[PDB]
Design an enzyme around this catalytic site. Sequence first.
Site, PDB file in Angstrom:
ATOM      1  N   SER A 104       0.612  -1.436  -0.131  1.00  0.00           N
ATOM      2  CA  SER A 104       0.693   0.230   0.236  1.00  0.00           C
ATOM      3  C   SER A 104       0.674   1.455  -0.527  1.00  0.00           C
ATOM      4  O   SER A 104       0.483   2.456  -0.213  1.00  0.00           O
ATOM      5  CB  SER A 104      -1.278  -0.077   1.234  1.00  0.00           C
ATOM      6  OG  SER A 104      -1.672  -1.234   1.051  1.00  0.00           O
TER       7      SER A 104
HETATM    8  C1  LIG Z   1      -1.311  -2.416   1.593  1.00  0.00           C
HETATM    9  O1  LIG Z   1      -0.769  -2.151   1.698  1.00  0.00           O
HETATM   10  C2  LIG Z   1      -2.838  -3.066   2.281  1.00  0.00           C
HETATM   11  N1  LIG Z   1      -2.428  -4.448   2.248  1.00  0.00           N
HETATM   12  C3  LIG Z   1      -2.716  -5.575   1.175  1.00  0.00           C
HETATM   13  O2  LIG Z   1      -3.990  -5.595   0.240  1.00  0.00           O
HETATM   14  C4  LIG Z   1      -2.077  -7.128   1.121  1.00  0.00           C
HETATM   15  N2  LIG Z   1      -2.109  -7.478   2.050  1.00  0.00           N
HETATM   16  O3  LIG Z   1      -3.327  -7.038   3.073  1.00  0.00           O
HETATM   17  C5  LIG Z   1      -3.395  -7.969   3.793  1.00  0.00           C
HETATM   18  C6  LIG Z   1      -1.679  -8.817   4.698  1.00  0.00           C
HETATM   19  C7  LIG Z   1      -4.548  -7.550   4.594  1.00  0.00           C
HETATM   20  C8  LIG Z   1      -3.558  -9.573   2.658  1.00  0.00           C
HETATM   21  O4  LIG Z   1      -3.377 -10.605   3.668  1.00  0.00           O
HETATM   22  O5  LIG Z   1      -3.687  -9.723   1.857  1.00  0.00           O
HETATM   23  C9  LIG Z   1      -1.111  -6.960  -0.232  1.00  0.00           C
HETATM   24  C10 LIG Z   1      -1.044  -6.206  -1.100  1.00  0.00           C
HETATM   25  S1  LIG Z   1       0.365  -6.507  -2.206  1.00  0.00           S
HETATM   26  C11 LIG Z   1       0.606  -8.496  -0.993  1.00  0.00           C
HETATM   27  N3  LIG Z   1       1.755  -8.494  -1.452  1.00  0.00           N
HETATM   28  N4  LIG Z   1      -0.184  -7.412  -0.162  1.00  0.00           N
HETATM   29  C12 LIG Z   1      -3.264  -3.010   3.781  1.00  0.00           C
HETATM   30  C13 LIG Z   1      -4.743  -3.470   3.611  1.00  0.00           C
HETATM   31  N5  LIG Z   1      -2.963  -1.526   4.086  1.00  0.00           N
HETATM   32  S2  LIG Z   1      -2.335  -1.288   5.340  1.00  0.00           S
HETATM   33  O6  LIG Z   1      -2.166   0.613   5.227  1.00  0.00           O
HETATM   34  O7  LIG Z   1      -2.921  -1.094   6.245  1.00  0.00           O
HETATM   35  O8  LIG Z   1      -0.877  -0.413   4.582  1.00  0.00           O
END
Ligand SMILES: *C(=O)[C@@H](NC(=O)/C(=N\OC(C)(C)C(=O)O)c1csc(N)n1)[C@H](C)NS(=O)(=O)O
Length: 448
Positions: A159
């Site tokens: 993100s």
């Molecule tokens: C952004 O970092 C966003 N993350 C995701 O959508 C990803 N994984 O999210 C979790 C960890 C919930 C999952 O288990 O899928 C993602 C994006 S690319 C990748 N390899 N995983 C989060 C939710 N945003 S944050 O601002 O809260 O960090």
Amino acid sequence: DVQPAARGSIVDRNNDRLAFTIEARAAERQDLRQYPGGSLAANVVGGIDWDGHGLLGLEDSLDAVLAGTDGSVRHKAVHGSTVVLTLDNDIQFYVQQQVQQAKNLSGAHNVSAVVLDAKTGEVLAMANDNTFDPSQDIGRQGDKQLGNPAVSSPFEPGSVNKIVAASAVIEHGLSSPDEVLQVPGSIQMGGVTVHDAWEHGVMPYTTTGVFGKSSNVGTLMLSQRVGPERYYDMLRKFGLGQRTGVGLPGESAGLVPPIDQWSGSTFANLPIGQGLSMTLLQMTGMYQAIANDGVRVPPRIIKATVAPDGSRTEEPRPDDIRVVSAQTAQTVRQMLRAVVQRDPMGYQQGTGPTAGVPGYQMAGKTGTAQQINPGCGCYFDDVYWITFAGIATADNPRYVIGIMLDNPARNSDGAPGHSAAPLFHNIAGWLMQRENVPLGPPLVLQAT
Ligand SMILES: *C(=O)[C@@H](NC(=O)/C(=N\OC(C)(C)C(=O)O)c1csc(N)n1)[C@H](C)NS(=O)(=O)O
Ligand SMILES: [Co+2]
Ligand SMILES: [Co+2]
Ligand SMILES: [Co+2]
């Protein structure tokens, strides 16, 4: 008959010595390399070999500048020049220590952090945990970090990459911070299913709230307004997939799939930070562009070199790269204040409220990226890269801070969770206090 050149020194921007040579005796004359700070910035500085030439780090990659050329008798000896870094040893020392205890507290496999000057992109601090000590023999330090992961080791950003979508949608006039959106809990895009990290129905998130709460669905809906071509163009302007030219050995270029090779599902992944990789320095350099009113300045760590006579030549400054307008940059900075905004009622709270420093317009973005399992070529379920990138401050950008944690079990301060926000809090707050920087209404992330 041989007239030996004296090795030049490596000093920080204020001429505080990081590495210098003293004459000693044993083949009787023997020059001893001194590292008065021990491990301080050793990821950058490197170490010396048995022959007094560079072994690794800048000692190696700048060895010709530092070693000079031996004379003879006549050919006069060209003594080594002194290399002046952009590093500030005080900032580096504090950041490097804080990175070590973020690693110990969070249980992460490793931690790294980069601090850039907002306007110039000069590297003021670059640190990782577990840094080796070049005053000690390398062969005893297999359990130490000898390299420079901040530049050498790319990762999927998740993100923190949303800065690109945010900048694109504002720059092309496709949305505004206070636009009330309608964001479902999941969508089908590019053949795949994208879901937010929390279960929810259609929510009236503002554009500000989409980035403040980190809605993947909201990000992709807004990215759909941008389109693949303008989105990919923005990625490139932000410098992804290309080495910065910072002047450090082993820099990775990262990886960005060019648009002519995109699958049907690439565009559903890149805007939320999946399907590409970047270094910590590249990530931090993205936020530097927004900090500097839309003009990206590729980071540099060599400030100048001093010739043996004492005449000093500044390093040539890299060329400006206009990414978005000043007006767009200022708007994105203000929006990302929502990420660090606290709300007791939950409704107007961002993902990283512990990153805020009261009295200052801190602004940033959290990242939590699922890591790839090497045994299957497929994603882990519970192994993350944690990132934070922020700007101190939104109304007066001075410092850009990027952080990454490799799979922490806890927060960077050791509380439950997986956030790097507390480490940004500590560093950015200390940078404000030490320069005595002097201290509106709450942003709306969720409408009615
Ligand atoms: C952004 O970092 C966003 N993350 C995701 O959508 C990803 N994984 O999210 C979790 C960890 C919930 C999952 O288990 O899928 C993602 C994006 S690319 C990748 N390899 N995983 C989060 C939710 N945003 S944050 O601002 O809260 O960090
Ligand atoms: Co001759
Ligand atoms: Co957990
Ligand atoms: Co505090």
